[PDB]
Write an enzyme that holds these catalytic residues in place. Sequence first.
Site, mmCIF file in Angstrom:
data_model
loop_
_atom_site.group_PDB
_atom_site.id
_atom_site.type_symbol
_atom_site.label_atom_id
_atom_site.label_comp_id
_atom_site.label_asym_id
_atom_site.label_seq_id
_atom_site.Cartn_x
_atom_site.Cartn_y
_atom_site.Cartn_z
ATOM 1 N N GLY A 53 0.737 -1.252 -0.173
ATOM 2 C CA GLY A 53 -0.042 0.094 0.130
ATOM 3 C C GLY A 53 0.818 1.229 -0.018
ATOM 4 N N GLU A 97 7.972 -2.129 7.426
ATOM 5 C CA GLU A 97 8.642 -1.384 6.512
ATOM 6 C C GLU A 97 9.793 -2.163 5.739
ATOM 7 O OE1 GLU A 97 10.353 2.468 7.894
ATOM 8 O OE2 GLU A 97 8.350 2.863 8.826
ATOM 9 N N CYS A 126 -6.928 10.129 -0.418
ATOM 10 C CA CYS A 126 -6.283 11.110 -1.246
ATOM 11 C C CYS A 126 -6.342 12.231 -0.244
ATOM 12 C CB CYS A 126 -6.688 11.551 -2.268
ATOM 13 S SG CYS A 126 -5.774 12.696 -3.140
ATOM 14 N N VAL A 128 14.005 8.841 2.619
ATOM 15 C CA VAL A 128 13.914 10.243 3.184
ATOM 16 C C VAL A 128 12.723 9.852 4.357
ATOM 17 C CG1 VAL A 128 13.305 12.698 3.302
ATOM 18 C CG2 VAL A 128 14.794 11.728 1.568
ATOM 19 N N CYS A 167 -4.407 13.591 -8.356
ATOM 20 C CA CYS A 167 -3.621 14.428 -7.637
ATOM 21 C C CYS A 167 -2.006 14.194 -7.672
ATOM 22 C CB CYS A 167 -4.211 14.229 -6.163
ATOM 23 S SG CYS A 167 -5.936 14.932 -5.845
#
Lengths: 160, 160, 162, 160
Positions: free
Chosen positions: D9, D67, D122, D143, D157
């Site tokens: 995701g 992660e 969003c 980052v 977007c």
Amino acid sequence: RGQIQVILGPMFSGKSTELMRRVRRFQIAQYKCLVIKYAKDTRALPACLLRDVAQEALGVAVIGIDEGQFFPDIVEFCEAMANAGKTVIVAALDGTFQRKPFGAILNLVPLAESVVKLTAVCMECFREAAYTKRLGTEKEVEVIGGADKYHSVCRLCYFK
Amino acid sequence: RGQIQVILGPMFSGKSTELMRRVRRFQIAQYKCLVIKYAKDTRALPACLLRDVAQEALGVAVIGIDEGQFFPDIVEFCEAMANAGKTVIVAALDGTFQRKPFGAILNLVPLAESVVKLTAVCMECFREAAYTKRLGTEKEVEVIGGADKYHSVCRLCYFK
Amino acid sequence: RGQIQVILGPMFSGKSTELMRRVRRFQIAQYKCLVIKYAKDTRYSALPACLLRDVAQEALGVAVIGIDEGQFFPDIVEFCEAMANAGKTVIVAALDGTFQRKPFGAILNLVPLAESVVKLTAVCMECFREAAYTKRLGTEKEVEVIGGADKYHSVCRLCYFK
Amino acid sequence: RGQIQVILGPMFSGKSTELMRRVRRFQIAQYKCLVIKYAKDTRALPACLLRDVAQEALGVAVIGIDEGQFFPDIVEFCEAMANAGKTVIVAALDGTFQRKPFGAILNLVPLAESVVKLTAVCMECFREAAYTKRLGTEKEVEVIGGADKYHSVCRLCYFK
Ligand SMILES: Cc1cn([C@H]2C[C@H](O)[C@@H](COP(=O)(O)OP(=O)(O)OP(=O)(O)O)O2)c(=O)[nH]c1=O
Ligand SMILES: Cc1cn([C@H]2C[C@H](O)[C@@H](COP(=O)(O)OP(=O)(O)OP(=O)(O)O)O2)c(=O)[nH]c1=O
Ligand SMILES: Cc1cn([C@H]2C[C@H](O)[C@@H](COP(=O)(O)OP(=O)(O)OP(=O)(O)O)O2)c(=O)[nH]c1=O
Ligand SMILES: Cc1cn([C@H]2C[C@H](O)[C@@H](COP(=O)(O)OP(=O)(O)OP(=O)(O)O)O2)c(=O)[nH]c1=O
Ligand SMILES: [Mg+2]
Ligand SMILES: [Mg+2]
Ligand SMILES: [Mg+2]
Ligand SMILES: [Mg+2]
Ligand SMILES: [Zn+2]
Ligand SMILES: [Zn+2]
Ligand SMILES: [Zn+2]
Ligand SMILES: [Zn+2]
């Protein structure tokens, strides 16, 4: 654009966690959120009837309901809130310890845009569990408790 | 190791196609399969009561049931076949044109190990559709027909 | 409002069937649809193509595009991305892994571009549990070998390594 | 019977929450569990390389990895653990801020028995989001940051 989402499953399948995951998605995007929990489960507004909490729900865009099976007015509330443009997310047991419909909760299914059934791990054989077994001999439907009073269980272990 | 899988959704969501997809998976792996269809949907054994086909179902490992909402014995049949070690897969409308439970079909949910609700395209606004709207004025629940008599519809278009 | 949807899974998981199910939903609602198949897969059971570029013009006049066996098109990524950016709904059925359980062509590059990704499951043809992989039966070493259950078994982790 | 499950995701889709939901299911059923997190994300064993943690992982039945995109050895670790009979559950970004594969993570897909891609909201138009947009101008892939540095975004977007 309102909506009803329903998260079903036996005990110990993480229904409440999935509810919160879904609610946090909207919250992090700046939506106003409200979570309602059943006041008599004490093991985030507590309530016994959803109508007692309907004024708070009106000022919010996203409503989460935990343990929806215990609210006698679950159907009329969700439907009215969705028709007023709110996103309503409901976590609930689909079945009692007897594998029967739990309260009025299944009447939500024909009203819902999204329905999922989560899975637990069988506490007796460790395969996938779809049902909840009561350990004791109590016969009434509403008996609050955790792994002390209930096991998530597969079909075979349910009938053992 | 028996089981019940339920495929819900409005009309035009591909419930029958998903049923066939799941059945073909077992068949390609050499399982004996049986598909039951509701005899009165004229628009693969035809039947009006599942009991009429119970003997054929007993000699098979996987049973698919299309349009399960129209069988009055859907619950007892599926539960009996699953407890006898069969894999039972049911495609069914969850809601009538009135968005009420369709027959006894929702009583399968607390007995099922897998429950999914499919989605259709709204035939009026082209967003996601969760419901079926009847186009005509007939009031009885059972009226056989396709896109000539029904539209898959979103919440907003349903109430338009 | 364009979109890429990806249907992954081993062989015999019904990816093509799920593709058709999704495409028919739009078609029944009056959308113009196009389905593209890999021309070199001539197995018994809809435009045939070897490159998606060869059918780009037909795809431009349609709202919904289905692609069967997307792993075999070298231009899968740029085609899907361009069609989705032009406002089309693109639905892709594809094997995620080869017989070696390695990425099949460029198809996984679609995953970060896709708004929807699912992985379907098959039945293990050797132990009858859930299968996530495809095992090649013969000894041929090249990636592209067309065939069905005569040449491949859908298989679980344990049966894959047996 | 080992296993790899992958939860993909964009940012803000609740991947970590779904990882924990799945791990808690096994834990409540008495399985020994270990959760590994990437040490350099400091916004449950911390690690930089999964090999540094492999001895702890061997004494456990269920391993969760948060992660996973940041571990260069994700593929060999998960494959080795699953082949040793462990259940490995991985939460990870599928795409970088450039919508390119994030590290080696997609090589898990052909090895996994279960693959899901979650969705976010969003933060710019409030529709469903599948991607992550970087707000600043930094060009390197790694980052660390939250909603201060990134928005979950839809296709339109993302390109605005
Ligand atoms: C099965 C069953 C449960 N209960 C009660 C016991 C619990 O107090 C409550 C179940 O709440 P849940 O939140 O459904 O239980 P849980 O926290 O294990 O599930 P999850 O992890 O999915 O969130 O309902 C009954 O009263 N009667 C019954 O027949
Ligand atoms: C909504 C509704 C449908 N029906 C009828 C109309 C159809 O003949 C039948 C619906 O069967 P389905 O198999 O649900 O219709 P379908 O072919 O569109 O489904 P799918 O695409 O998902 O395979 O039931 C009623 O009798 N009463 C109702 O209230
Ligand atoms: C695994 C593998 C398949 N193939 C070929 C075999 C088939 O022709 C094609 C796979 O097409 P699929 O359509 O994935 O196979 P299928 O039709 O059996 O699956 P489904 O039921 O999901 O539709 O790719 C290779 O060439 N190399 C490989 O390593
Ligand atoms: C998109 C992107 C994120 N990141 C970093 C920023 C964060 O420190 C970290 C985010 O990982 P996640 O755990 O996906 O972030 P999250 O907390 O939003 O996840 P979830 O809510 O789904 O659990 O990755 C990069 O370094 N490069 C990138 O291109
Ligand atoms: Mg709870
Ligand atoms: Mg049908
Ligand atoms: Mg195919
Ligand atoms: Mg995170
Ligand atoms: Zn069991
Ligand atoms: Zn509509
Ligand atoms: Zn096997
Ligand atoms: Zn947007």
